[PDB]
């Protein structure tokens, strides 16, 4: 079943969502050539534990050994921070943060460009964020989740990119991954009509080349089969009476916090 959050639950998710967003705001200035992904992870964990008094939902989860996921270039998702993996000028990097506070999860990710913005990968990142924003603008009671995945795929493909099929957004709350699965492509047989108080993520993974992926020697890391660049952005939301509220909004987002579809 998909749980409907109570008003108190939603308030706790506002807090957890803000904390996850804060991690991404904090880490940004550290993302520069020469830093290791292991160091970035250490800085994130320190902040989550010691400044936010929260805990990483990733660390220990199905044995995952780090506190955030950091995915560079052709890595699609679930890249494992490593002390020896150094960022280079021109890299694109996803950092994906999930924190638990007061029993509730907040889950969000964004892309960072290492160095100047006008590089191979910039347009991929921008379009990936735009695909997330397109989807967020659709969320309201009475829409079928089917429609949202179809819209993401149509947009991404019209931009000359492909959508990763094997990974999806998810319900979230007291649990990390709850019902429903939020597909980012058109699947005629879905699904699920949205209702106020549902909380879930949208997190499209978009490849510059072909859609196919390969899962690596470590039980987590996913790369593009063609080693083309891949980008992802993620937000956690709550469905409101006439739209949604974006719980993991950051200072650099360019979409409104609260989206309303009423006249
Ligand atoms: C190591 S679990 C990482 C999960 C990821 N934060 C997600 O959005 O599902
Ligand atoms: Co995430
Ligand atoms: Co997620
Ligand atoms: Na990538």
UniProtKB/Swiss-Prot annotation:
Catalytic activity: Release of N-terminal amino acids, preferentially methionine, from peptides and arylamides
InterPro entries: Creatinase/aminopeptidase-like, Pept_M24, Pept_M24_MAP, Pept_M24A_MAP1
Binding site for a divalent metal cation 2: 107, 170, 203, 234
Record note on cofactor: Binds 2 divalent metal cations per subunit. Has a high-affinity and a low affinity metal-binding site. The true nature of the physiological cofactor is under debate. The enzyme is active with cobalt, zinc, manganese or divalent iron ions. Most likely, methionine aminopeptidases function as mononuclear Fe(2+)-metalloproteases under physiological conditions, and the catalytically relevant metal-binding site has been assigned to the histidine-containing high-affinity site.
Cellular compartments per GO CC: cytosol
Known cofactor(s): Co(2+); Zn(2+); Mn(2+); Fe(2+)
Enzyme class at the top of the EC tree: hydrolase
Entry keywords, A to Z: Aminopeptidase, Hydrolase, Metal-binding, Protease
Sequence positions that bind substrate: 78, 98, 177
HAMAP family reported in the protein's UniProt record: MetAP_1
Subunit and interaction comment: Monomer.
Task performed by this protein: Removes the N-terminal methionine from nascent proteins. The N-terminal methionine is often cleaved when the second residue in the primary sequence is small and uncharged (Met-Ala-, Cys, Gly, Pro, Ser, Thr, or Val). Requires deformylation of the N(alpha)-formylated initiator methionine before it can be hydrolyzed.
The family this protein is said to belong to: Belongs to the peptidase M24A family. Methionine aminopeptidase type 1 subfamily.
Name assigned to this protein: Methionine aminopeptidase
């Amino acid at each position: 079943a998909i749980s409907i959050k109570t008003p108190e639950d939603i308030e706790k998710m506002r807090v957890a969502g803000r904390l996850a967003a804060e991690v991404l705001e904090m880490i940004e200035p550290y993302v520069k050539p020469g830093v290791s992904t292991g160091e970035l992870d250490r800085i994130c964990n320190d902040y989550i534990v010691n400044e936010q008094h929260a805990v990483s939902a990733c660390l220990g989860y199905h044995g995952y050994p780090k506190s955030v996921c950091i995915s560079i270039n052709e890595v699609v998702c679930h890249g494992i921070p490593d002390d020896a993996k150094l960022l280079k000028d021109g890299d694109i990097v996803n950092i994906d943060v999930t924190v638990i506070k007061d029993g509730f999860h907040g889950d969000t990710s964004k892309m960072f460009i290492v160095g100047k913005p006008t590089i191979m990968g910039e347009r991929l990142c921008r379009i990936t964020q735009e695909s997330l924003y397109l989807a967020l603008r659709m969320v309201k009671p009475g829409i079928n989740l089917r429609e949202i995945g179809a819209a993401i795929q149509k947009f991404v493909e019209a931009e000359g990119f492909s959508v990763v099929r094997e990974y999806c957004g998810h319900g979230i709350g007291r649990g990390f991954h709850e019902e429903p699965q939020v597909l980012h492509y058109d699947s005629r047989e879905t699904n699920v009509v949205l209702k106020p108080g549902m909380t879930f993520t949208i997190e499209p993974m978009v490849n510059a080349g072909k859609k196919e992926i390969r899962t690596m020697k470590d039980g987590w890391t996913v790369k593009t089969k063609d080693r083309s660049l891949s980008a992802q952005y993620e937000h956690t939301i709550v469905v409101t009476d006439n739209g949604c509220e974006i719980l993991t909004l950051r200072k650099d987002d360019t979409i409104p916090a609260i989206i309303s579809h009423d006249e």
